[PDB]
Amino acid sequence: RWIARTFFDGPEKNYERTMAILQIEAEKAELRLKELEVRRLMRARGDGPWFHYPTIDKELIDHSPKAT
Amino acid sequence: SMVYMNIMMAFTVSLVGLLMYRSHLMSSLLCLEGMMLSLFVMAALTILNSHFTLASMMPIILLVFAACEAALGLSLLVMVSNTYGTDYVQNLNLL
Amino acid sequence: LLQVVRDHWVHVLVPMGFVFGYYLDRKNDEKLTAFRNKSLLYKRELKPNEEVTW
Amino acid sequence: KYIIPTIMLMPLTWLSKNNMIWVNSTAHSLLISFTSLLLMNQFGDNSLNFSLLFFSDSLSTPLLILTMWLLPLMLMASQHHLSKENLTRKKLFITMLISLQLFLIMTFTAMELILFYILFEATLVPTLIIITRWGNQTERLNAGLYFLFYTLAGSLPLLVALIYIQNTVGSLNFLMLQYWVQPVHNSWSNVFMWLACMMAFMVKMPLYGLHLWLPKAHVEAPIAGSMVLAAVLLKLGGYGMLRITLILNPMTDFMAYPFIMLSLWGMIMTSSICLRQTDLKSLIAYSSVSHMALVIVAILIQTPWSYMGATALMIAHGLTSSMLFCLANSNYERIHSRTMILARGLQTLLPLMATWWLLASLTNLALPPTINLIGELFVVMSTFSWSNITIILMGVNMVITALYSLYMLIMTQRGKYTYHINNISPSFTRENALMSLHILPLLLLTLNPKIILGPLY
Amino acid sequence: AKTVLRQYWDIPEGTECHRKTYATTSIGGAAGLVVSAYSVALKTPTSFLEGVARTGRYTFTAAAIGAIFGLTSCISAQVREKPDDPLNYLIGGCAGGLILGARTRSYGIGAAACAYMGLTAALVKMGQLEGWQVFAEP
Amino acid sequence: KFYIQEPPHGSPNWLKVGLTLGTSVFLWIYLIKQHNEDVLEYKRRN
Amino acid sequence: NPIIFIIILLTIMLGTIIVMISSHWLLVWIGFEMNMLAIIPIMMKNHNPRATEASTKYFLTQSTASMLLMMAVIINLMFSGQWTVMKLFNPMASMLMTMALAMKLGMAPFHFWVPEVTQGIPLSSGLILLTWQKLAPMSVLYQIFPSINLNLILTLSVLSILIGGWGGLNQTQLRKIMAYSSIAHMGWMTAVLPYNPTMTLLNLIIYIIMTSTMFTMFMANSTTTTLSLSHTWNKTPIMTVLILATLLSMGGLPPLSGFMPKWMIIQEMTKNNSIILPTFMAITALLNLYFYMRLTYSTTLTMFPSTNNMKMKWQFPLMKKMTFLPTMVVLSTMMLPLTPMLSV
Amino acid sequence: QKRLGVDLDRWMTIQSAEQPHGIPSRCHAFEKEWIECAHGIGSIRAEK
Amino acid sequence: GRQGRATFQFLPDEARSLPPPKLTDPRLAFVGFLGYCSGLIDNAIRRRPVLLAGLHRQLLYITSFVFVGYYLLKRQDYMYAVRDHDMFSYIKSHXXXXXXXXXXXXXXXXXXX
Amino acid sequence: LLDLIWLEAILPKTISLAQMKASTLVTNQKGLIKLYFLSFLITILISMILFNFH
Amino acid sequence: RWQEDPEPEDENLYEKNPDSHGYDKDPAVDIWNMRVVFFFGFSIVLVLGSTFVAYLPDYRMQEWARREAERLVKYREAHGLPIMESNCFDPSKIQLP
Amino acid sequence: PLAYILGEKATKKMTEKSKLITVDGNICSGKSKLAKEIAEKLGLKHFPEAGIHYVDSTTGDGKPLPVQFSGNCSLEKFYDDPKSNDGNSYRLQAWLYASRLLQYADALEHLLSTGQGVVLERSIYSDFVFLEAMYRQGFIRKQCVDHYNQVKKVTICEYLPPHVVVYVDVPVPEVQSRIQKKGNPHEMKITSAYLQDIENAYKGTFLPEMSEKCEVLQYSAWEAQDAEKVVEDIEYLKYDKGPWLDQNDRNLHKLRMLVQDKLEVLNYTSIPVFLPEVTVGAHQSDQVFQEFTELPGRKYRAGYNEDVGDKWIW
């Protein structure tokens, strides 16, 4: 009982805790698997703003020339 | 199509002429002039046929940088003839 | 008071370093506060004290 | 609580004056070892979590306590050695032992496969410098080159294995998170996936093949018989085998079947060579192959009994073999050549050390239950459930374990020592302290080793 | 050539043997010419006299490596059932890697390469599955 | 010894010493004031 | 040399800026040839027969490199006709683009100049200007990361570590070992470019800093292993400890931050269903470590290079980045593993 | 571009741009389709 | 992954300066230790007595690594947020690509021994 | 036979092979810019025909 | 000949000069190190430490389960019919086919 | 040293009425010491001849280091009676060459910064006369001379200008009687054939020294000890078409940068080639380097040290 105080965390700790660490771990694992799933799609088809190659130009010239 | 079958062929012939050697180091620099000359004609035909007007200045700039290499590399060739008697590929010391 | 600081300048650092480790790792409990009162395993509605599990 | 007192041991040696050094490095590590036994011994229903994953927790690790116990014990042995060298290099050396123990604290506590591996390989660099410098014998460079040739060629296949598993299934990181485990369907692509995870821990856990890594590191010793205890920690440093076999691949263990067979002759033929050899350190080096081969046999069976025997054997070998190296250190500091035939005669010069020779040699055998019998007996009883024929192979090993201890005793019991003019002084106060601080924890673990052999026990 | 390598994964699908051996020599002979092409640039004494001899020592041996590896693949196909096995073409790599010590009279270099060539060529036949790719795009 | 035969450095610089001790404080003020500005910016945006 | 040496050095700095900040194909062409005119005077310096031979061997390989690169620029007018650095738009021009950039870098087939050029450099100040020069062709390769074929980049990356790993084993010259580690590291550079163009820029950051820490610590004059041997006892013993932190980091060791490229290059490649290539990367990397294995024994051991002449006067070199950079080169794996995002 | 040119103009690279006086390109009308088609990233990575 | 709606010149975007910066972080302290470590080995290469007790130009070495490290961490906090933001927005827009599977108690083979 | 000679041999074989294949790249082609440039013509010819990319 | 290398050192004191010592150099510091601070770690960590190794740390429900099992044996024998074990974890769950 | 673009430049307010005048070739006896002391009217600074204690005297702090720490078993008294079997012979000469290279580097630095007339007592270009004379009789091994020539080819070529005025002293073969007349017990009882070979080798060494476009002047014993005759000849004879006349912008600055630091100039002096006579053993050299660190000279830094100075910590 003396060893339980100021030397031990207790059974309440690491049961309420660790599950909190697992809750962050579950979020870290699912989003990393989602990142592997998103990059597998975004690289194959140019749909989103990920792995997009730069284009030539947006605007260059529109004025009237001396063309035929 | 028609002309590009010769001037590209002249480039590949000069590409062989650079890397092939018969001990003379002067001939390699002479072929570097030809390489830039073949690049000059190939660029000229692409710009003159498809009327660019803006890109016509670019081979003129290319002509400047053609002579930049084919003089500063030529000056190093003279330094070989200062240290050694006559310029040869066989005459080397590096390992 | 004057001789102890010069002779035992390094002798104090290691047990005080343990106190620094005792405090820093204790402060990590506030980072892990999710399901502290929640999750049915040791959960009980506390009234005299706020937040039983640390 | 184990982060930044070992890091606070680093400036202690540099700041302290030239007269002290050794008095500070030992005293401010013994109280740190007291706190490990004070806090880490507590367990709930399953594995806990001390903090967020920088250093995690303990599941079946009283092996962490052993490293904390050897945290001052290496400094005890290297006292006669490094006494005539430069004072700045003494400060440089103790920090390198501390750095080894720093990463060793990290590897046992961290319940990762990614953070564990890079700090498992972070123990390789300090040992390399510790072996290749202060080596008393010539061709110590072969002991340095092959140390990183055998290990790294087997362990770099973990990078292509571990990252491949987390790319397919969630993430390895938290381990207690990793119960998304799908059974391995036994395919040809999965063949090299299993092999790459194992081969990394087939080098540090010595088999019959790829076992030359160990004796060369011991014959060409880092320091006489003092820094060999760190190489004993590297032997038990292959504890990742307990975690990989359990979590990463539980279904496919058909490929484990040839590896048990390879380590089965790594019991008899590794003990046969350890009978004629001249070097006293090599007679411990080849015996350390066989006792650590017991774990490799055990783990690959994957039965609950084998894990009880293995975890006991990891602690058993860490305090018994290291104690034998301290006896080899005491003989080498007097004669300056580790020849067994030359150094012959106890009791005539060393009366008290002869009793400590017995309490260290006989522990290789199964004495009244210390931790070695408790380690071995559960493994032999586990091999019978695997196959009935094993005890015929295991029984030969039980005979040659007596040929380990008694042959070390008899070749020192023969009272002569005619050519020896040295070894006049019996033993220093710190010399007998090494004999006590290694054996008395083994004697205290005779009573109740419940907090030693504990993977759910 | 890429066209010849793609033909190599169509002949063993059936039971054709006499054209399979010629397909392996066309790879081994061409790869023998590649290794020998660098050896010409290593200063050959007397041009077109010992330079032809330097090509003759490499191209003939490398084609013979492919010839035996081609032939033993057909012997292992006829004898014993189950055509698709890593162990089936392991002996083919061993017999093909046996004549590496036939270039020079030593019988030790070829014997050491026998286990190495036998294992590496088996990995190629292991690489028919989806879990083995040398080059990838995404 | 008394630094005989012309010493290269006695270190009474005050030119380099004044700038090294000076600019470090100038770095301290520049980092905290922008941090205090960013603390106000984080509250205003969200 | 007065201001003119700084002006020449500033035009290499300006030369790569034209390569970095660019959109036009002839603009980067100038940027490469701005360096060609500016490295050669620093290649010469001390009026040596070795310096004349190295510069001529350097020029004739790299002048042909630029003219092969200009061919790729002209084919980009033959087809499409757009002069914006984004894609080659050709299966033919992409071949003449990658192989031309391989000539300027230390990639597999055009590597023969690298060791003999490095030997002919007079001083440690000129030795930096090859490791820093490799930023210029790498910057273009980052811009044209698509439309370039795997069969003629990855083969040149795999072979370069093979020839780099066997190219320093029969060498004792300190310049030659650094020249073949250059060939070795370039294989780790171009292997990432298809499997996400990111981390190639960070691989430069680790490499350029780690190479610059070497030559700044080689300011105490040493050209061979036997000349760097007399350093443990005749010279300062703390200097051997700090070079040990840079020798071991160049090889694949996790406690040091030279493992930080070998962290992500394998990680990004394994994401895209390729395992057989990263295995071949790590095993051949041990041969690169093996050069430093025998080179650590020059500093860790006594090795008996005493020499009767003893130096009493303290060494005073330049040592500009010799203190700030090795602290980052030794430890950054624990400091910034999130720096992948900050760099690219 | 590895480093972009912000708040400064040094382009004049693409065809059918600002004319020297008023002189047209030989393929002026075709790039009026091409630049307008591929101004976004949709047909840059896929090019279909 | 790669940059899309982002431009160079001035490393942080300033338009997306919403997330809170790192305040007294353990990551800042470790670079601060490296700033101190760079101020220890400078007295080792250039021969100066006592790495701990020497010349006080070390204050510049501590501040520089903290200053550069702060903006480097600010770039880290920005780029990791944007990479996450573009990932979340891709799922919200398409929806058909990311499929959800829930509630399963599927039969699996049991291993012996 | 086993523990010293044969069980070691497997990797000393790869050490001896790496040291033997080192000479085929270091000691090979002693000087001469002719010899280095002649090999470059072959590498282009391999890339055009053998390792074909159009 | 080496002209510098031949200088051998062989000095093992142990008893000659300090009379009673654990290590060389300074006898006053040696008594305080080899006999005092080594033995305080020999006393506290081994004797006062032994009251933490196995002596009352509770330790993974070893004594807890004894009080838990004894009350469950009497409960399922008097009230229930099966003797504490029949089916594990799954009472009428989802079938395989 | 690095930024010379401002006021401080080479040949600025210098190289006019200031020249390096080397007084060398004293055969065996200390005859050059009298001529150098007399030549103090025109020349501003006159450096003494380099010995065993010079390396500790310069750059250190006043008092010379002990014989065990400064030069490993190196003594001038051992060369007075030279003997076989693990003796000095060559390793003292290698230490003597290192000291003479050090004093020339200091003198040339003293010439470039603040233009003054520098007088040197036996320079680098007279050292091979002192070595080859010892080689003619059975003293030094053949391989050691070739080791010396490797140092000779590297260290000298770093310095572009050799000398301005070289003084030649040719005395009578009865110079051994003058050496016996001088109060030196160590210098006495030396070989007469060695001193005769030293004068014979110097005659064939003075010819390339004179042909190297440096003003060479010969002096006799009767012409010696003259303050008026020696000074008038130095002022009248002008150096023309010599290697000393070089470009101030390129040649002089590169010479000044190489001579600015002592460690940079002596970096080429340490040869990697292993020699049994040149001290190879590291085990005893480890304690010898530790004894130098234990010594209260420098040990801690280039300038400031504990229990020596240090006004401020920063």
PDB file of N, CA and C in Angstrom, chain D residues 117-137:
ATOM      1  N   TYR D 117      14.492  -0.640 -34.724  1.00  0.00           N
ATOM      2  CA  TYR D 117      15.508  -1.080 -35.690  1.00  0.00           C
ATOM      3  C   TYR D 117      16.669  -0.098 -35.881  1.00  0.00           C
ATOM      4  N   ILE D 118      16.350   1.191 -35.998  1.00  0.00           N
ATOM      5  CA  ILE D 118      17.369   2.235 -36.202  1.00  0.00           C
ATOM      6  C   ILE D 118      18.207   2.524 -34.954  1.00  0.00           C
ATOM      7  N   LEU D 119      17.661   2.200 -33.783  1.00  0.00           N
ATOM      8  CA  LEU D 119      18.404   2.287 -32.523  1.00  0.00           C
ATOM      9  C   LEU D 119      19.039   0.947 -32.126  1.00  0.00           C
ATOM     10  N   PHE D 120      18.571  -0.130 -32.763  1.00  0.00           N
ATOM     11  CA  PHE D 120      19.204  -1.453 -32.713  1.00  0.00           C
ATOM     12  C   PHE D 120      20.513  -1.430 -33.506  1.00  0.00           C
ATOM     13  N   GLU D 121      20.523  -0.655 -34.591  1.00  0.00           N
ATOM     14  CA  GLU D 121      21.719  -0.440 -35.410  1.00  0.00           C
ATOM     15  C   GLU D 121      22.576   0.727 -34.904  1.00  0.00           C
ATOM     16  N   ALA D 122      22.032   1.494 -33.958  1.00  0.00           N
ATOM     17  CA  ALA D 122      22.760   2.581 -33.292  1.00  0.00           C
ATOM     18  C   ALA D 122      23.645   2.087 -32.141  1.00  0.00           C
ATOM     19  N   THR D 123      23.528   0.799 -31.815  1.00  0.00           N
ATOM     20  CA  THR D 123      24.414   0.135 -30.852  1.00  0.00           C
ATOM     21  C   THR D 123      25.655  -0.439 -31.546  1.00  0.00           C
ATOM     22  N   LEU D 124      25.579  -0.558 -32.874  1.00  0.00           N
ATOM     23  CA  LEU D 124      26.652  -1.122 -33.701  1.00  0.00           C
ATOM     24  C   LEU D 124      27.881  -0.215 -33.822  1.00  0.00           C
ATOM     25  N   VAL D 125      27.644   1.093 -33.941  1.00  0.00           N
ATOM     26  CA  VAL D 125      28.709   2.098 -34.114  1.00  0.00           C
ATOM     27  C   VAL D 125      29.586   2.289 -32.854  1.00  0.00           C
ATOM     28  N   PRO D 126      28.977   2.463 -31.647  1.00  0.00           N
ATOM     29  CA  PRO D 126      29.815   2.561 -30.438  1.00  0.00           C
ATOM     30  C   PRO D 126      30.652   1.312 -30.140  1.00  0.00           C
ATOM     31  N   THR D 127      30.080   0.126 -30.362  1.00  0.00           N
ATOM     32  CA  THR D 127      30.796  -1.150 -30.196  1.00  0.00           C
ATOM     33  C   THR D 127      31.962  -1.311 -31.172  1.00  0.00           C
ATOM     34  N   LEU D 128      31.778  -0.834 -32.406  1.00  0.00           N
ATOM     35  CA  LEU D 128      32.826  -0.827 -33.436  1.00  0.00           C
ATOM     36  C   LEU D 128      34.069  -0.060 -32.976  1.00  0.00           C
ATOM     37  N   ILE D 129      33.851   1.130 -32.412  1.00  0.00           N
ATOM     38  CA  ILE D 129      34.922   1.989 -31.889  1.00  0.00           C
ATOM     39  C   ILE D 129      35.543   1.375 -30.621  1.00  0.00           C
ATOM     40  N   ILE D 130      34.702   0.765 -29.784  1.00  0.00           N
ATOM     41  CA  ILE D 130      35.143   0.094 -28.549  1.00  0.00           C
ATOM     42  C   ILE D 130      35.980  -1.175 -28.828  1.00  0.00           C
ATOM     43  N   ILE D 131      35.666  -1.881 -29.916  1.00  0.00           N
ATOM     44  CA  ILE D 131      36.440  -3.063 -30.341  1.00  0.00           C
ATOM     45  C   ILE D 131      37.758  -2.665 -31.032  1.00  0.00           C
ATOM     46  N   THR D 132      37.671  -1.793 -32.039  1.00  0.00           N
ATOM     47  CA  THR D 132      38.828  -1.418 -32.878  1.00  0.00           C
ATOM     48  C   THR D 132      39.859  -0.508 -32.191  1.00  0.00           C
ATOM     49  N   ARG D 133      39.474   0.095 -31.066  1.00  0.00           N
ATOM     50  CA  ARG D 133      40.404   0.837 -30.211  1.00  0.00           C
ATOM     51  C   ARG D 133      40.533   0.135 -28.856  1.00  0.00           C
ATOM     52  N   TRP D 134      41.720   0.244 -28.253  1.00  0.00           N
ATOM     53  CA  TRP D 134      42.085  -0.407 -26.974  1.00  0.00           C
ATOM     54  C   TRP D 134      42.115  -1.949 -27.018  1.00  0.00           C
ATOM     55  N   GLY D 135      42.156  -2.508 -28.229  1.00  0.00           N
ATOM     56  CA  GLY D 135      42.274  -3.952 -28.433  1.00  0.00           C
ATOM     57  C   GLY D 135      43.691  -4.416 -28.167  1.00  0.00           C
ATOM     58  N   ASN D 136      43.837  -5.315 -27.193  1.00  0.00           N
ATOM     59  CA  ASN D 136      45.147  -5.805 -26.745  1.00  0.00           C
ATOM     60  C   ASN D 136      45.855  -6.711 -27.759  1.00  0.00           C
ATOM     61  N   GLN D 137      45.072  -7.373 -28.612  1.00  0.00           N
ATOM     62  CA  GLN D 137      45.595  -8.297 -29.623  1.00  0.00           C
ATOM     63  C   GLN D 137      45.647  -7.679 -31.019  1.00  0.00           C
TER      64      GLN D 137
END
